[PDB]
């Protein structure tokens, strides 16, 4: 069934599972043509496939050349996502294949179901959570590797850096979703908060700064305040 607030701790048990977010798979700019009509230009995108227990991220970069000569690209994007997710599962040893795949958007169920027909014991699930994984391209290192790619490419990351040496999966995922929620609501402020202190650097093999435990507390409070402020502004509350 669907994933929600009730069955949220299931994400951190020992059944292997992946989230798939397709929001950044087909990305365009919209512009005016010489004759004043509107046209789109595609830029590189990515599939965001994440194991929330371990932090392992399988960033499949989607090169604009995929779209060349194709129609109904937003529909195609769903099938290409499902094609690539299926190929990733096939590539993994049996004992690493997930028991569930949770798609962040319901329009992905049928394409993935059809591509996973060879895996009848892998359950494809929607979710009722409003996960902020579209803000993945607000993480500077991920956006950079997507935009520089010249061919289809899978890049692997741990999205939790080394946090799990000191905190549980549950807490790690809560930090990740808070950070991404803030980046989504006000990218400029979110990023200011993270980088203001130039003495706190990002390791070459990490995505986020090397905050101490106490600095993470101050950061997390600052991101909560950002999110609440933007809400009152959005709704006049």
């Amino acid at each position: 069934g669907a994933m929600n607030s009730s069955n949220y701790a299931e994400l951190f048990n020992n059944d292997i599972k992946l989230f798939v977010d397709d929001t950044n798979v087909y990305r365009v700019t919209v512009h005016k043509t010489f004759e004043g009509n509107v046209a789109t230009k595609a830029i590189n995108g990515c599939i965001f496939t994440l194991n929330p227990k371990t932090g392992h991220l399988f960033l499949k970069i989607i090169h604009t050349s995929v779209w060349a000569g194709q129609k109904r690209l937003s529909q195609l994007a769903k099938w290409k996502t499902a094609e690539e997710v299926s190929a990733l599962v096939r590539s993994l040893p049996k004992e690493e294949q997930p028991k569930q795949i949770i798609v962040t958007r319901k329009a992905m169920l049928d394409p993935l179901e059809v591509h996973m027909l060879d895996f009848p014991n892998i359950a494809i699930r929607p979710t009722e959570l409003r996960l902020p994984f579209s803000a993945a391209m607000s993480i500077d290192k991920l956006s950079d590797v997507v935009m520089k790619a010249t061919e289809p490419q899978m890049v692997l990351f741990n999205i939790y850096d080394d946090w799990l040496d000191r905190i549980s999966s549950y807490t790690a995922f809560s930090r990740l979703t808070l950070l991404l929620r803030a980046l989504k609501t006000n990218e400029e402020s979110a990023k200011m908060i993270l980088l203001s202190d130039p003495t706190i650097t990002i390791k070459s093999y990490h995505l986020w700064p090397s905050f101490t435990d106490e600095q993470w507390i101050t950061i997390e409070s600052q991101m909560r305040d950002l999110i609440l402020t933007e809400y009152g502004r959005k709704y006049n509350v």
Binding site: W79, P111, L117
Partner: protein
């Protein structure tokens, strides 16, 4: 013209023959149906006045034998049987007519309804869906489940319709995942028509039989099967022109014949809205679309 005599009518029951039906009172002297048109399948069905649940009945073809009805007080229902003694059977039929205790199959001569609902239904195919090979007629009732339903418990009593499943390996070629799921032509034409049904007439026959079982017995898995086979054609970009035109006639008479008050359970909103308005074949069901709008504009 043929006759299906009844030994007696011990219990109050509504008797249908094809689309016609009669009320018969407990121990009323009712003794059969005569003038039944040779050349088509037929169905004689029952609903006891005391249990408006379990509609049940028998598919038969009079060319295949002499058949009659007899109430069983142990099993509590009217049973179809075969009389092998030809002479003994004409003897019973002639005496009952002489006494005029039989209703005449009430066909209006202008009416092709029954022909149109049964054009492709052949008794031989029925008996493969309802396997019970010691009888030449087939029993069906309100509660019988299909083979596909069972998979998701007693198989002797199953409706062995052809299983259609849009999210199966059968339906989807590896490497044509998106193509085949959006355009079911390969499933319709290669897998089902050429592969399993051999030709469109056997396909249409199962479709019509599924519809009739849903209409006459409220058989829910039959309704599912009828809608599935409709959706499979409508969801295919490449359909023989002869099938599309025959399909529009088939569905027209099915929609025309349905009881108005049952449109809520027997008609699946998504399937029809998709077939008539979204599908590849939206523009190919002009009569079916016209009757649907003028009769059930709500469902749409």
């Amino acid at each position: 013209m043929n006759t299906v005599p009844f030994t007696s009518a011990p219990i109050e029951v509504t008797i249908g023959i094809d689309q016609y039906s009669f009320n018969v009172k407990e121990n009323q002297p009712f003794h059969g149906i005569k003038d039944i048109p040779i050349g088509h399948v037929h169905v004689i069905h029952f609903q006891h006045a005391d249990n408006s649940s379990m509609r049940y009945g028998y598919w038969f073809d009079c060319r295949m034998g002499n058949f009659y009805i007899q109430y069983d007080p142990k099993d509590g229902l009217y049973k179809m049987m075969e009389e092998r003694d030809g002479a003994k059977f004409e003897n019973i039929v002639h005496n009952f007519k002489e006494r005029q205790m039989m209703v005449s199959y009430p066909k209006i001569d202008e009416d092709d309804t029954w022909y149109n609902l049964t054009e492709f239904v052949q008794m031989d195919k029925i008996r493969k869906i309802v396997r019970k090979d010691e009888n030449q007629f087939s029993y069906v009732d309100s509660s019988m489940t299909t083979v596909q339903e069972n998979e998701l418990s007693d198989p002797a009593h199953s409706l062995n319709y052809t299983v259609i499943n849009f999210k199966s390996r059968e339906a989807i070629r590896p490497g044509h995942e998106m193509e085949d799921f959006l355009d079911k032509s390969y499933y319709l034409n290669t897998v089902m028509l050429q592969g399993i049904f051999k030709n469109s007439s056997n396909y249409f026959g199962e479709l019509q039989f599924a519809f009739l079982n849903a209409m006459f017995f409220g058989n829910y898995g039959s309704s599912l099967q009828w809608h599935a086979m409709i959706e499979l054609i409508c969801s295919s970009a490449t359909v023989p022109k002869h099938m599309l035109d025959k399909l529009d006639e088939i569905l027209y008479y099915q929609i025309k014949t349905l009881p108005e008050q049952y449109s809520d359970i027997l008609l699946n909103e998504r399937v029809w809205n998709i077939c008539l308005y979204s599908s590849f074949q939206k523009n190919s069901l002009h009569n079916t679309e016209k009757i649907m709008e003028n009769k059930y504009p709500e469902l749409l």
